């Protein structure tokens, strides 16, 4: 049966996971030395390997060949965990199991020995959704549980949990994956999938991933569906609404030089062409940052913008740094309020007019 | 008032002033406070 | 069809008992004492039965019908009391009451206690039928202006001596709680048999146990007496009343005042009052509130109210009472720079 | 629901993925109101549940098609908020997930439609996350939302996002002209007002919203010279207050753009009102009032049960305060 | 265990009751004259003698001698009441007895005659928590109780109780014992137990009790524990410092007087206490708001708080409106920016420094 | 293999680090025999409320008698140590929050203890009990049976009713000092025969605010990361906090208005692979420390002593107003970091804001 790239390429060993070297090393060393805790909380942004790392740790603990740092993935228990069948690996959703009876039976069945494995792993997802009474009741279990149960906790944000929970759990901060790691993983996946890919497309997808690899895979699947089974630069640009042209620079120049009619015409034609407005704001922010950098250090400018070098240089010679900071601040304010505006076009126009109000 | 102050206000910078000196005591030897 | 008051009800009972009695009002002490006096007069007349029932859809009526259609085995000429529901009679209760009036018997002495009926509820078949032999005793709680005279009369009836200071202290401590006021008077009489109650005497043996309503707080803010507004806010806070109803009641009058002030630039006040159909007794109060504050106020007040609502139902904090008392002081003739209140 | 012509291409694309068996289980349609995303989702579900589909369209006579017409298919477990409410609870998601947890009665494919993921509760979305991550075989989800940013980051991550772009401006204008008999200027004003999404403009024309907009414009025209903005409350206090606030914001934006110099304005149908508003107010005042109006509209939309008239009159009083000379005008800042 | 002072020193006679002179005199007159009301309501605050006075009334009303205001304390009834095992002394709590079934059972049991007591006294506690059904049942049974039963209600917030209960009940709201009475009682208790103490320690304990004798007894027991069988000024002062939770007011005072080292010391103490920093900022902001309102109107300071009344009054009268305004604005800005501060502790310290030794440049409304 | 927190739980009054006042009070009470019937313990997480409560329970029920120095070898002591003591009733407030459950709990209070001399009750997070539960518990708290002791515990004591507070002896445990945490970590690591470095212990103690349990958890995580050893590099990498020297050099470059050094330092940080928000937080912390040093002389702990002198220079040369300006600029940049196109871009733009608005040496203003 066909599966999406996120499900197809879920890591099955501690070597298939990309990034998060520190937490993986800590887990492997703990498993090797036998110093294993009873509460592993994983904190980080979405699409960084919370569930993947938790399942890998569960496989390592429950492997039939003893506690192994890198589970083989072929045992009966290993395969069942990989398929989400292992009874001793209870995957609980915090939001669903918020009622009193749910937690009461959760802490009442701990005494029963594991059915198959040597540890009755409890993988609780988005633990921050549990009620305060749930945390209070589970403190005792999280402190001194029996030596047959391990609690694996996953939450997008750890600060919302009670301080006691953080005290009783080993916290692993999954770092957001950088652009290079996402690009390398996408390149490897596409090569193993026998799908042609261009470096520009991979770079754009990694940039749009915003640090989450699941989002990168979802964008790749979207491009595949729209790109007639081909990861082409033009298809990815059309899907993502990336200008990658001089329109952003011209609009920034118009904004700095007031001339509201030019800015309005540029926005009108951009809307007619149907682009992504968040992409336009990000491009403007990048251009303003580059202008500030060249004002500080002229050598900090690349050659990709060579065709627009001199004009850009003119801004670095014409706009004082304080005005650049003001424009960047206004663009960021527009970025923050763009989702909440009545319309995306209205938000962009308000941001640009506010920036236009500023002048020497 | 000045361009500096107006820009800092627009950026959200409070520009805290001293007003009540003397409270700053200890190993403080600020000869030139730029004021 | 005689409308009377509990103060003079004793003479009415003495001259002769009436077939139908009904006590309407909100004052608890006045209702209780009127009921006790009527029951004692009935017992002296020779009525030994004192049946009491509470009107409610859950409660049945077969027992009431049987007792009204039957005497007592070891007594005669029963007396029946009906406790009306707080909201008031509904259609089913109206049918029950007219049925009771249909088979009402002279030997039965009817007493009714509950909140005072409204104009719409005033007219009814059973009420009109009983009007031929109905004596209704108004039992409303006297206003703040009427409180000092009432307490002075109460003390004089008790052979005590109260000065102006003691009367003011009693009014302040037991405003709207006349039952506690009478209990305090009895306690002071017991403590000092001499009967002379000076300011130290009363002040050393009293407690703040007044009860209020949000309308009283809004009235206090309109008048502008800061002490009364703070006292009523404290009493409501201690009573556990939620601030939502206070905020809504304040908001209604605030919007009315804003509209009147803005539209009074070139329009007579009388026409606006007539159009708005506001209470006649409140015309002068609204005029005083309008001329006491100018358009510079009624603007930070609305913004303060909005901030209070936001901090209430978004932050879910407990500092709502502080904001309420700040707004109370603002509505009075006070500077209230509003920097503290973030108006 | 209605199937608009501009849904023809995108549908023909999406179904093609399902024609190859590579369709994404979780689909999130980013479409503005009036774009007919509901019709697209219904057509996709009909194609998926058809027993003997031909080409792209469903046969229309197999058992699946008959059940779809009757609206009693054992599969096709739709999620929507209660009629008397405006949000979807976690219990509905729980029961729908439990129903999806087993095989389809017809033996084909199971479809789940979330009418509006924006209304989905945080707990409900978090519960749906698990079933969305690894749906059972032949299980398909069709979410919908105007602003995917408002959704949770995780939920947006799970889904494959498809953006239903609106038609060309001229195409929408001519479609509305063929539909509604009204001056082309009004049609263009409605289209620009509705973010250039036909259908939403058609819905606005069908209801009394157009008369409300005209009344609000007349009230603002009377208020701007005299400065008595409080009267605007009379034309603003209504159950559709957010829409009226959006109309006022668009009018202010048009006036500000006219001040800065522009060739096109959203409220093209009222050049005189825009000109008067731009002339009688300075750009700083226009910006401050527009920001305040947008903030209050956002507060009204997001906050539940907020006292509408209180917020509106507070906004009016603050606007009147801003017009007074020498008053510091607030500026937006995160 | 040597018992505890609160349990040992329960007043077993009216003569040894501290304060509450008016209530004591009223009860003595009622018992002597033979006039006893159907129900009694003792209200006030905690640790003032509501339960103690109720038990004194119960034992004096059912004493073998008769209805006397000076119970012997040696008969079977008095001794049983003192031991808290008298069958007719039916002590119940509205906490776990608000159920319809439990209230119905109590009402049914009321009719039965006392086992060996002249009156079957019901000592109900926290009556303000009774549900509407239970409250109505209590009112109905109090409308005309049997002559052999009595009700001694002991609440703590009469405002919750509607006046209907007062319509058939006599109230004896107690008052705060005041510092002098508490200090004298503590001195008597310590002397009677051959416990060494200093007058300043007793003064500190009485002032810290905050008008509650039970609190004073607990505090002096703590002093004995930490003092090693002897109350001393240093021991009680250290105990108070450990237990003190008024860091917000002290910080406000230090900011008012611009005592930087005092502010640092108070912040360190709060960190040792480990109080939530945003909560501390909110408390300080509320204190500043209360100071401003007190300056606006003296009545703004409610009587609900009395331990910091003098401090609040002196701060309100001393500082001008402008300084308190500046403090409030700086604290508000600090609270708003606290989430983005490098640390909650660092954010609190920074906002305190800004308030005490800085001032924000206000914006200018540039002409149009 | 067992967790450090569980293995190194105190087993005698001596083992407890800090909290001298409560330990002395309890020891004196047990020795003199003046034992109260209701003790409330308060503080922050991990300070040792439960440890002290269990030590008191051991002292009360010890076979040798009631003493402040329990033997630790008799059956009662071993059972309490293992958490399998019948009379020591460990109750959770959240488990029984309704009035009915607490009434059921109190129904069995009258019965005599099984084998222990007292029927000690230890309620965890007592503040979670409802108001009705508190009121029901009041009567038993005032006059409990002579063989019954209550040991309440809660992180937030302000939620309790005033009656409950007055009915029991309060003991507010204080957050442990950083030096105490470091000493405890060093002692346990030495007992376990584990290599460690002073800087790593200082970093761990700083990470654990006042909760020794967090210190032990972080120490265990560092043990895992370092493969059985606690090295400064491993702890620094795990915490994600770069060395203070780099942030100090960054702020020195920022104040000097030389952007080349700032660019070089941020490039080196990027090469090191350190999250940018941590760098910004460190810069803000350094600025705050400088401001505090300006306010008072003794504002820097001994942990920063290695770089104290240099820091003091920045206090003397840099005025306070521009220190506040830099602090505000960095704080607003951190406010804007999430919405920036990139974390590196956000930090770069914040530093450029700081340099452009530099008071002493503003960046050049070309027309
Ligand atoms: N660190 C990673 N290494 C390798 N693949 C990853 C990683 N993070 C995410 N993925 C991919 O994304 C899929 C789903 O992401 P997850 O592993 O569940 O991360 P996640 O943090 O658990 O997502 P959330 O928090 O539940 S939204 C996996 O099956 C992988 O294909
Ligand atoms: N007026 C008093 N005179 C002497 N001792 C008192 C007095 N009030 C309290 N005490 C002491 O404090 C102990 C407990 O006092 P209580 O009478 O229970 O306080 P309380 O009014 O019952 O508080 P509540 O009703 O439970 S909130 C008594 O056993 C005495 O030792
Ligand atoms: N004061 C202390 N003395 C010695 N070790 C301590 C101390 N506080 C904490 N520890 C250590 O940290 C562990 C946890 O201590 P606990 O007392 O269980 O934490 P806790 O305070 O009971 O948790 P809370 O307050 O309910 S969140 C102990 O087993 C010790 O190893
Ligand atoms: Mg996951
Ligand atoms: Mg009591
Ligand atoms: Mg604990
Ligand atoms: Zn295996
Ligand atoms: Zn078909
Ligand atoms: Zn006796
Ligand atoms: Zn022992």
- The neighbouring-strand order within the major sheet of chain D is 2-3-4-1-5
Could you tell me the radius of gyration of chain D in angstroms? 23 Å
Structural class of chain C: alpha/beta
CATH class of the largest domain in chain D equals Alpha Beta
Succession of helices and strands of chain C = EHEHEHEHEHHEHEHHEHHHHHHHH
Number of helices of chain D: 15
What's the helical proportion of residues of chain C?
40-55%
Number of domains of chain C: 3
Condensed summary:
The structure is cut from a larger assembly and holds three copies of chain A, one copy of chain B (35 residues), one copy of chain C (343 residues) and one copy of chain D (334 residues). With 360 residues, chain A is of the alpha/beta class.
Explained architecture:
This is part of a larger assembly, with three copies of chain A, one copy of chain B (35 residues), one copy of chain C (343 residues) and one copy of chain D (334 residues). By secondary structure, chain A is an alpha/beta fold. In chain A, 54% of the residues lie in helices and 7% in strands. Chain A has a five-stranded parallel sheet with strand order 2-3-4-1-5. In chain A, strand 2, helix 5 and strand 3 form a beta-alpha-beta unit. By secondary structure, chain B is mostly helical. Chain B contains one helix and one strand, in the order H-E. Chain B is elongated, with a radius of gyration of 13 Å. The relative contact order of chain B is 0.14. Chain C has 343 residues and is of the alpha/beta class. Chain C is built from 17 helices and eight strands. In chain C, helix 7 crosses helix 8, helix 12 packs antiparallel against helix 17 and helix 16 runs antiparallel to helix 17. Chain C starts with a strand and ends in a 12-residue tail after the last helix. Chain D is α/β, with parallel strands linked by helices. Chain D folds into three domains: 167 residues, P-loop containing nucleotide triphosphate hydrolases (Rossmann fold), CATH 3.40.50.300; 40 residues, Ubiquitin-associated (UBA) domain (Helicase, Ruva Protein, domain 3, Orthogonal Bundle), CATH 1.10.8.10; 122 residues, Zinc Finger, Delta Prime, domain 3, CATH 1.20.272. Chain D is 54% helix and 7% strand. Chain D contains 15 helices and five strands. Chain D has a five-stranded parallel sheet with strand order 2-3-4-1-5, sandwiched between helices. In chain D, helix 7 crosses helix 8, helix 8 packs across helix 9 and helix 10 packs parallel to helix 13. The longest helix of chain D is centred in the C-terminal third of the chain and has 20 residues. Chain D is elongated. The two termini of chain D are 40 Å apart. Strand 1 of chain B pairs antiparallel with strand 6 of chain E. The site of one phosphothiophosphoric acid-adenylate ester has 20 residues of chain E, from helix 3 and helix 10. One magnesium ion binds next to helix 3 of chain E. Chain F: Belongs to the DnaX/STICHEL family. Chain F: GO terms for molecular function: ATP binding; ATP hydrolysis activity; DNA binding; DNA clamp loader activity; DNA polymerase processivity factor activity; DNA-directed DNA polymerase activity; identical protein binding; metal ion binding. Chain F: One of its GO terms (cellular component) is DNA polymerase III, clamp loader complex. Chain F: This is DNA polymerase III subunit tau. Chain F: Its EC number is 2.7.7.7. Chain D: Keywords: DNA replication, DNA-directed DNA polymerase, Nucleotidyltransferase, Transferase.
